[PDB]
Structure 1
Amino acid sequence: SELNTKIVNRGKEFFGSISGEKPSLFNKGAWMGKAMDWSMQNEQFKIQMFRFVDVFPSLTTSKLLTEHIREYFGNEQDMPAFMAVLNKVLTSNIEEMARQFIVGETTKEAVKNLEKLRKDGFAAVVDVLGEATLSEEEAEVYTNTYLELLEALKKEQGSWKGLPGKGGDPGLDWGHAPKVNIAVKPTALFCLANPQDFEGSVVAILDRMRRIFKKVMELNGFLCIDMESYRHKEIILEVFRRLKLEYRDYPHLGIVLQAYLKDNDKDLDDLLAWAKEHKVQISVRLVKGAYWDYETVKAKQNDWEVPVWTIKAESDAAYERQARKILENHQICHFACASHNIRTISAVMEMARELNVPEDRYEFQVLYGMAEPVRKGILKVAGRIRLYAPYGNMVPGMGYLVRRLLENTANESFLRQSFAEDAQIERLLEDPAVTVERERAARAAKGLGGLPPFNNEAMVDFTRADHRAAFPKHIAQVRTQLGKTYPLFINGKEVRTNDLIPTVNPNKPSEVLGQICQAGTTEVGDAIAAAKAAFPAWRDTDPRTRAEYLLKAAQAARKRLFELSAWQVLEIGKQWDQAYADVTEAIDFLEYYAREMIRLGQPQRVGHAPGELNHYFYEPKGVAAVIAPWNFPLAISMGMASAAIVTGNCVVFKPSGITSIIGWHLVELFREAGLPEGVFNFTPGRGSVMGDYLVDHPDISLIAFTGSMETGLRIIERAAKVHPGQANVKKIISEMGGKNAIIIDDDADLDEAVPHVLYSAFGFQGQKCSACSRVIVLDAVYDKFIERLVSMAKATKVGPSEDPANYMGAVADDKAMKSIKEYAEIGKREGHVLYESPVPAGEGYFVPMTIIGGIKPEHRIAQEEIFGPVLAVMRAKDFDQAIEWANSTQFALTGGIFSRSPEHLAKARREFRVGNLYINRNNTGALVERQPFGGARMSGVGTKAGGPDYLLHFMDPRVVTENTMRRGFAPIEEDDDWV
């Protein structure tokens, strides 16, 4: 109460001394102020304006600029009044808004302007614009930019008089702070920063951070480590902890902690405890956090718990609480209050006074070019105020710029409420804990048939220590299970044959995982007869009961998630994330197709004529042959088999030879679920022995196939014949290849495009039907794009997938390795090799990560599916040729485009006619419901797994029509057209 009254009064004095002055961004007399004002009034404009700011620096020609302006804002008559002559004026206004937030474009300019800040009474923390670097070379340039900055400041600082204080050392700012203070972003220091390779990322970042830190120490300066997105939070904490311990006696090292994270109370507490345990001192810059929108979207997309508070006052309350904790611990922890919020600043000031904290233990910081009246008020009241002063160019600084625009204009922004909305001061200065209680209470004021709605199973989350630790443990566990013989499974019984084929670790072929029995035509004949005998009872089973078996199987897989994943790492060479996502997709199919059968399972009345009932409903076809691929050995198999099973068919299942153990997991899961015998039959076998036999058989009514075009087309041809005794015309559900292109338009965001294209091309060694095998790059952006793509590629390592440090590993088997390598030779003769990775020496089916330029549509590697880590780079003269080239193959599965032109995106949506088109992201990793997968042309037959049309393909519709009139009367039904 009493402290809170002091805080409120301090805040009132603050607003009083501000004298009504508005920060420049809220100055309606300025163009910037007008543009932000309209963005705040009109959400559609805000979206257009911020997106235009983002794309602006890549509008490097007059044509690009004129066209983009028209497409984002409309013609001159239809755009707002505050908005060729037009190109020049708008360019000037955007340029000036960007310069608003930086102290310079270069090191020498920054240094000049920093001395100007000192004369106005301001300290600085200098930052070089950049984040999320794309290569080792770029990380080196960023690093050397700091070294150059430090050399320059080293020369200058001796001539700088220390900013005024009340005591201490006259050569230091305010008597105590080092005059040179810099901030560094960890993700700018290493382009593959990923907690999936936790130690690898820590070391690579720490190594460059150390070089910078040594130079900082050399001039008695301060180094602060910025905090970035939640994905890197633990990595960054570890870098700080390690670096601190190597130089335990050096006081001027800081770390950012974000009060908007639910983790932060524990993290702050742990860090303080850690500092005590090691008897070192630390420094914390407490912020709220800059990535709120991003964290909420990212967690939502992956069914992760949202790592940030979601009521704005909760972050404010957390800040006051955590700042009090830091101030109390001022002996061990130096404090930088980083906030533009007058309530927050006032709370810190009164808490510090109440605890009599020495002034050398806390200072205040704000962002350069923002909240100008607040900055001046702090200078007047506290005296110790530091500006975060970045420098550099618009492209690497674009994230920063957009974050500032977002920060100032958000509905919940303290600055917007104060300086745009004329919000009441009492409300603004209210204790946010009160606000929290009131908001939470206001906020305290679906599925079908008892089932929760569909949601995709949450992705593995390597920000968690337990998830990181799970893989090595489960891989070892799997290693105790090697060397078994896997029999056929037919009508609930194991059937052994004497033709065994070993399955091996593609990254270590001498490691034999097991031996697989092969079915001959006799055993396949037996599986078909078993399925046919089980069919009548299974068909007569209630759809909701059939769905329940899928639900139980899903729960069985969920309880074995990491175990099932580890099997794939070893048997087929999946990377950890790839393995896990394979299993979660299996679970999704089970959960989704169960719900879909429940939805489609109730007969629907059709028509509304009285005296008549028509019910429309579906019947299964009979026995389904399911011929599964090796590249998604649990997901796609389970997808195809469970769809066929849930719709009332019985299945004869042929796993791919090299992933037959994963195929055995379907036996384990369906057994665990209690599935009646004969409904699922497991029959691996040699295609050359029983492949045609399975497909030609008269008792097969349906064939679900996922694999190569040559095989799919053969199956389609053979299946069309009706043999004697054959009950139905065979239904084909087929997913075949792709030759997938991603287009890189002139205006593409290259920082997004590059890592997305690399992942699309080389994720899982390129062994996906959706993989990017052609990247088609617009003439004017080509050299910039390919230099960055190649440079990022050179940073990646090729090696065993059980080691998370490797980006990709060996391909499926010896035949694939030989085939892919020959294609790379073919490609190297057609075009010109741009990159060819090292591979480890010794055993393993390794193919280099390979990038080839100069490719044209008439070349073999622009047409034929390689199914491996071979990327063709094609140079298009204009957007029209890029589309024509994207459409130049016989396939139409997936595709992508990086572009920020509304016109080019619309042209792409219309003409780039693949089954799944991706805009501004990778073209792989389709999720159930979100991205139903499949295409036409030579890529398939227009069936889409994971979508609402899929189960229909496994059934035939029936209608029963009843005349309900007997002797002149009929019951009246609710949906009848009557009188």
Structure 2
Amino acid sequence: NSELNTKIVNRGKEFFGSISGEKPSLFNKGAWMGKAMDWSMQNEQFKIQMFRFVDVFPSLTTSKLLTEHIREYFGNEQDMPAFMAVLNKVLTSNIEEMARQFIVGETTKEAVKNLEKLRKDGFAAVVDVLGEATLSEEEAEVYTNTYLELLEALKKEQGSWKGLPGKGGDPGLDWGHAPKVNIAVKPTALFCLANPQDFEGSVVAILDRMRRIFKKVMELNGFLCIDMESYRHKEIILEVFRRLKLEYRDYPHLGIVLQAYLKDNDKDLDDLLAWAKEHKVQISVRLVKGAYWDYETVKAKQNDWEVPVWTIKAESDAAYERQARKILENHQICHFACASHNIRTISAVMEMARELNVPEDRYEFQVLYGMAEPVRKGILKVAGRIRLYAPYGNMVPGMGYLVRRLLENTANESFLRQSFAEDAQIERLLEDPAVTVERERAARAAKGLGGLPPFNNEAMVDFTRADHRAAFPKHIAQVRTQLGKTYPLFINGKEVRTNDLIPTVNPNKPSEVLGQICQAGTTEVGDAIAAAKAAFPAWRDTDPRTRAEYLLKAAQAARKRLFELSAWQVLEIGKQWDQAYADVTEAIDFLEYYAREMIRLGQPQRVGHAPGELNHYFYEPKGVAAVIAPWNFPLAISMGMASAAIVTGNCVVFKPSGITSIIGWHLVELFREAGLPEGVFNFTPGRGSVMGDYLVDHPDISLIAFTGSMETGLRIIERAAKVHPGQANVKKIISEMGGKNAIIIDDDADLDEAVPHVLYSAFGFQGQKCSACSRVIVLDAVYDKFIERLVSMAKATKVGPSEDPANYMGAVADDKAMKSIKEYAEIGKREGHVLYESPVPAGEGYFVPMTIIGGIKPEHRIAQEEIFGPVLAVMRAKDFDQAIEWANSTQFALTGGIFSRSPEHLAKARREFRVGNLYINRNNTGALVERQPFGGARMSGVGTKAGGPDYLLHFMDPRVVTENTMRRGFAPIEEDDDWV
């Protein structure tokens, strides 16, 4: 709209004029922070070092930690920038000063005092309470009580404050209309287990605390704003706002933050306004662009989710202006807080409101305390109604907040950087962002092999979606209509029934029988081996691209059944919703990845370059593969091992674990739907005590793929090494065995991240993973604090049936597992000291308490033996060297983790913490195909890594054909010949 746009541009021009060249302190090159940010902006390596240093800074609580980190992040004094122990003191004082710039105080009393100073300078405030991530109920209560404490202090003071001057209205209110007390609350800080996987439980827990705060706010006629956090919780937070509003439909001073950088926001704003109209209530919206842009883009890309944010910056600006116009048009029902430091954005809001003649009591402006100083002052001068978002509290979360402000101010796309560091042209700065979008989209308008798209991991289940949340109960219900079947063997394309049946039951409810499984004797296993051996010649002679096509069809068949296949796993083996879905996506990943790997490896390659000669190097299968699969990843690992053997040209005799035989039957369904030729895949569940050695010992077996315990793996290795009469090959072992995996918690670890990652690593799926954290090795000086937070978080979780998404973990695999694990828990309780032992439900189910035991040392049994259940050992290391020594003190070497923000300690861990899969600053479980090829050596395996580029070669043997191409003195000349 050209005329309006011209007014906006002129308003912006007047604004830049009234600023008089003033730079915000962060861009003041005369100040230390300005020099620091200037160099960060010119030098990306320095920015990364400086910003990461500020992040770790509040953990550097001794002189040694501090001195060492300074050297590790910035190098020696001679190699540092000019603007930078005396060095300890100067750096410390400058960083602390930077953080204080952005906070109104450290105590409630100080905050209140400083808020009054702000009022005398003409500024209103919205107060926020700084806090570390809420990891427990006790922490949520502290946060809640801090708001209550703040409100009580403000209640006593506000009567003595003259209201900020306005043009009309009520002289006891700010600008004649706004409540003097205004606070903002982060909803997820009110509940440590906030998760849309438990949508209702999360809404209620947050709502119950928000209600308590809100009641006190109303008691002093104040305003409560509910802030918006990451996209993961956006729908939860919207629902919290809607419920609290309907509980107090007549109270006007309740706001919600909406983020214009979200593609969803056009619909969300429209829905909320329509909702307010329908319910005949009023609302208030603080429109922001959004604070988590890099996080959302990374998180979505890590999970093959649609990126929920716009990714061209002008799109967020254009969305803001569009959505602000929508709000202002609806001022009758919607009060507006314009929260932005962008002069174009601010100018657009001002002129749109003027054009729509919106009453001034329906819109105000907000900025963050301590930044964009000239912008703040310009708003005061032109609009008069300006509120500062003012955090207060402890310096530890204050440093985290500081880093976020530094990121915001120094971003390449930041309006503040462009205006105040980069000398950007005013006309460009104030351009209609809609025009910017068109130009940027047009600019941006200007790989796989063999016609196949490149490999990408299958999208994870996404419980931000109502449809994904609804799918599970529906599919679990459908599965229940299918219970009670008898599952036969499947051999040479035919169903073969035996009369030895073993029931398979729900571990969370053993009275619920899912079905009966036929058991193969040695006769039937021998039959299956015979069928596989007979199908082998034609299958080996099938083109690798064709073999790969069967895997691609199986992947599509599985993809079309994703929630159904997932539901079976929830009931048969007690997978939580996310765990079950991830099992199926991983199976799909193996199929898509191994299909592409065979296509890659399937072409004979010329080796050497001598003329008159062609050497071609290529691979052939081995023969019949025995595949012996675990129950803990019943589709993923089964499908991975079987499909690798199949795509490489082998034929498979497959023994699923008894308690997940139905999931094993899914392989039959999937390969049959793909049209796999008869005998290439044979399904023979059976009693190991009857046919286990028989399968491994058989002369017609050429390879054995096994995943499971070390004891069984080692027995297989010993027996397989013998060559019996009639045996064609030396048997090839592909084996993934157990682990006793440690995560190290260094002194400088970010405990907000370390704690929930350790909890998930230890207790996700009841701890039943070869990759699970069973030892947490914690540095002396952070031990007490770490353990308090871990135990408190554990106490908040619930143990119960996996079909109920409210439960964190549930029953273990079967009766034998429960008894074994419980015995290990008793052993550990006599070795160390019990720190936590959860309640479990009464009645039936193979429940083992979520168990945490401290005081564990390397010489203890539960520091050495794989328990495969929810029993976590906590070990206290005297220094980092001992932490590493202890991590390396078992016979296993599968996975490991380290939380540390020390370059030197991370380097030492990369080199010396010699596990097959080492994870830095995140959980040590959940390895993905291609990204984390999985497996190790020592007693954890034989160095084969599933889901990686070396895996398929283990299922084959290389061959070379060498041809003398010269006849009667001449040879064809080939493209890669070394010629003349």
> Hey, what's the Cα distance between the residues in 1 that align with 2:732 and 2:94?
62
> Hey, what's the Cα distance between the residues in 2 that align with 1:34 and 1:665?
62
> Hey, what's the Cα distance between the residues in 2 that align with 1:486 and 1:285?
59
> Hey, what's the Cα distance between the residues in 2 that align with 1:880 and 1:415?
45
> Hey, what's the Cα distance between the residues in 1 that align with 2:354 and 2:185?
31
> Hey, what's the Cα distance between the residues in 1 that align with 2:398 and 2:205?
23
* Cα displacement string for residues 594-642 of structure 1 (whole angstroms, at most 9, x for unaligned residues): 0000000000000000000000000000000000000000000000000
TM-fit CA distance, 1:399: 3.5
* Cα displacement string for residues 363-383 of structure 1 (whole angstroms, at most 9, x for unaligned residues): 000000000000000000000
Please give the secondary structure, in 2, of the residue aligned with 1:396. helix
Is this contact kept in 2: 1:575–1:802, CA < 8 A?
A: yes
> Hey, what's the Cα distance between the residues in 2 that align with 1:751 and 1:909?
23
TM-fit CA distance, 1:94: 0.4
Is this contact kept in 2: 1:891–1:937, CA < 8 A?
A: yes
> Hey, what's the Cα distance between the residues in 2 that align with 1:729 and 1:4?
79
> Hey, what's the Cα distance between the residues in 2 that align with 1:237 and 1:922?
30
Please give the secondary structure, in 2, of the residue aligned with 1:633. coil
Please give the secondary structure, in 1, of the residue aligned with 2:819. helix
* Cα displacement string for residues 197-256 of structure 1 (whole angstroms, at most 9, x for unaligned residues): 000000000000000000000000000000000000000000000000000000000000
TM-fit CA distance, 1:571: 0.1
Equivalent residue number for residue 869 of structure 2? 868
> Hey, what's the Cα distance between the residues in 1 that align with 2:131 and 2:483?
48
TM-fit CA distance, 1:719: 0.2
Is this contact kept in 2: 1:131–1:185, CA < 8 A?
A: no
Please give the secondary structure, in 1, of the residue aligned with 2:397. coil
TM-fit CA distance, 1:400: 2.2
> Hey, what's the Cα distance between the residues in 2 that align with 1:214 and 1:356?
34
> Hey, what's the Cα distance between the residues in 2 that align with 1:148 and 1:968?
99
* Cα displacement string for residues 108-160 of structure 1 (whole angstroms, at most 9, x for unaligned residues): 11001000000000000000012631000000000000000000000000000
> Hey, what's the Cα distance between the residues in 2 that align with 1:881 and 1:12?
63
TM-fit CA distance, 1:393: 1.5
Is this contact kept in 1: 2:132–2:396, CA < 8 A?
A: no
> Hey, what's the Cα distance between the residues in 2 that align with 1:710 and 1:288?
56
Please give the secondary structure, in 2, of the residue aligned with 1:494. strand
Is this contact kept in 2: 1:585–1:927, CA < 8 A?
A: yes
TM-fit CA distance, 1:281: 0.2
Task: Say how many residue pairs are matched.
Answer: 979
Is this contact kept in 1: 2:99–2:398, CA < 8 A?
A: no
* Cα displacement string for residues 13-70 of structure 1 (whole angstroms, at most 9, x for unaligned residues): 0000000000000000000000000000000000000000000000000000000000
Is this contact kept in 1: 2:460–2:582, CA < 8 A?
A: yes
**Matching of residues 308-707 of structure 1 within 5 Å:** 308-707=309-708
> Hey, what's the Cα distance between the residues in 1 that align with 2:827 and 2:396?
38
Is this contact kept in 2: 1:132–1:190, CA < 8 A?
A: no
> Hey, what's the Cα distance between the residues in 2 that align with 1:257 and 1:126?
18
> Hey, what's the Cα distance between the residues in 2 that align with 1:890 and 1:944?
19
**Matching of residues 787-826 of structure 1 within 5 Å:** 787-826=788-827
Unaligned runs of 5+ in 2: none
> Hey, what's the Cα distance between the residues in 2 that align with 1:813 and 1:108?
57
Identity %: 100
Is this contact kept in 2: 1:861–1:872, CA < 8 A?
A: yes
Is this contact kept in 1: 2:328–2:358, CA < 8 A?
A: yes
> Hey, what's the Cα distance between the residues in 1 that align with 2:220 and 2:53?
42
> Hey, what's the Cα distance between the residues in 2 that align with 1:314 and 1:235?
25
> Hey, what's the Cα distance between the residues in 2 that align with 1:84 and 1:711?
57
> Hey, what's the Cα distance between the residues in 2 that align with 1:321 and 1:241?
23
* Cα displacement string for residues 686-727 of structure 1 (whole angstroms, at most 9, x for unaligned residues): 000000000000000000000000000000000000000000
Equivalent residue number for residue 922 of structure 2? 921
Is this contact kept in 2: 1:597–1:951, CA < 8 A?
A: yes
> Hey, what's the Cα distance between the residues in 2 that align with 1:401 and 1:518?
63
> Hey, what's the Cα distance between the residues in 2 that align with 1:641 and 1:800?
30
> Hey, what's the Cα distance between the residues in 2 that align with 1:570 and 1:495?
26
TM-fit CA distance, 1:397: 3.2
**Matching of residues 85-100 of structure 1 within 5 Å:** 85-100=86-101
Equivalent residue number for residue 214 of structure 2? 213
* Cα displacement string for residues 257-313 of structure 1 (whole angstroms, at most 9, x for unaligned residues): 000000000000000000000000000000000000000000000000000000000
* Cα displacement string for residues 154-176 of structure 1 (whole angstroms, at most 9, x for unaligned residues): 00000000000000000000000
Is this contact kept in 1: 2:408–2:414, CA < 8 A?
A: yes
Equivalent residue number for residue 719 of structure 1? 720
> Hey, what's the Cα distance between the residues in 2 that align with 1:563 and 1:131?
40
Is this contact kept in 2: 1:491–1:677, CA < 8 A?
A: yes
> Hey, what's the Cα distance between the residues in 2 that align with 1:156 and 1:458?
53
Is this contact kept in 2: 1:824–1:850, CA < 8 A?
A: yes
TM-fit CA distance, 1:490: 0.1
> Hey, what's the Cα distance between the residues in 2 that align with 1:381 and 1:712?
76
> Hey, what's the Cα distance between the residues in 2 that align with 1:920 and 1:131?
17
Is this contact kept in 2: 1:756–1:921, CA < 8 A?
A: yes
> Hey, what's the Cα distance between the residues in 2 that align with 1:402 and 1:551?
46
Is this contact kept in 2: 1:131–1:187, CA < 8 A?
A: no
Is this contact kept in 1: 2:103–2:398, CA < 8 A?
A: no
Is this contact kept in 1: 2:337–2:363, CA < 8 A?
A: yes
> Hey, what's the Cα distance between the residues in 2 that align with 1:434 and 1:113?
42
> Hey, what's the Cα distance between the residues in 2 that align with 1:285 and 1:642?
53
* Cα displacement string for residues 714-760 of structure 1 (whole angstroms, at most 9, x for unaligned residues): 00000000000000000000011000000000000000000000000
> Hey, what's the Cα distance between the residues in 2 that align with 1:527 and 1:10?
82
> Hey, what's the Cα distance between the residues in 2 that align with 1:47 and 1:187?
28
> Hey, what's the Cα distance between the residues in 2 that align with 1:131 and 1:186?
13
TM-fit CA distance, 1:106: 1.0
Please give the secondary structure, in 1, of the residue aligned with 2:940. coil
Is this contact kept in 2: 1:742–1:776, CA < 8 A?
A: yes
Please give the secondary structure, in 2, of the residue aligned with 1:824. helix
Please give the secondary structure, in 2, of the residue aligned with 1:314. helix
Is this contact kept in 1: 2:626–2:704, CA < 8 A?
A: yes
> Hey, what's the Cα distance between the residues in 2 that align with 1:672 and 1:244?
52
> Hey, what's the Cα distance between the residues in 1 that align with 2:151 and 2:389?
16
> Hey, what's the Cα distance between the residues in 2 that align with 1:395 and 1:135?
18
> Hey, what's the Cα distance between the residues in 1 that align with 2:107 and 2:736?
54
TM-fit CA distance, 1:394: 2.5
- Do residues 754 (structure 1) and 755 (structure 2) align? yes
Is this contact kept in 1: 2:916–2:936, CA < 8 A?
A: yes
> Hey, what's the Cα distance between the residues in 1 that align with 2:762 and 2:476?
27
Unaligned runs of 5+ in 1: none
Please give the secondary structure, in 1, of the residue aligned with 2:673. helix
Is this contact kept in 1: 2:626–2:703, CA < 8 A?
A: yes
* Cα displacement string for residues 450-477 of structure 1 (whole angstroms, at most 9, x for unaligned residues): 0000000000000000000000000000
Please give the secondary structure, in 2, of the residue aligned with 1:892. coil
TM-fit CA distance, 1:959: 0.2
> Hey, what's the Cα distance between the residues in 2 that align with 1:290 and 1:399?
13
TM-score (norm 1): 1.00
Please give the secondary structure, in 2, of the residue aligned with 1:938. helix
TM-fit CA distance, 1:401: 1.8
> Hey, what's the Cα distance between the residues in 2 that align with 1:549 and 1:402?
51
* Cα displacement string for residues 856-910 of structure 1 (whole angstroms, at most 9, x for unaligned residues): 0000000000000000000000000000000000000000000000000000000
> Hey, what's the Cα distance between the residues in 1 that align with 2:667 and 2:109?
65
Equivalent residue number for residue 844 of structure 2? 843
> Hey, what's the Cα distance between the residues in 2 that align with 1:513 and 1:371?
64
Please give the secondary structure, in 1, of the residue aligned with 2:53. helix
> Hey, what's the Cα distance between the residues in 2 that align with 1:35 and 1:777?
34
TM-fit CA distance, 1:321: 0.2
> Hey, what's the Cα distance between the residues in 2 that align with 1:836 and 1:710?
29
* Cα displacement string for residues 944-966 of structure 1 (whole angstroms, at most 9, x for unaligned residues): 00000000000000000000000
- CA RMSD after TM alignment: 0.4
TM-fit CA distance, 1:392: 1.0
Is this contact kept in 2: 1:543–1:646, CA < 8 A?
A: yes
- Do residues 781 (structure 1) and 782 (structure 2) align? yes
> Hey, what's the Cα distance between the residues in 2 that align with 1:226 and 1:752?
21
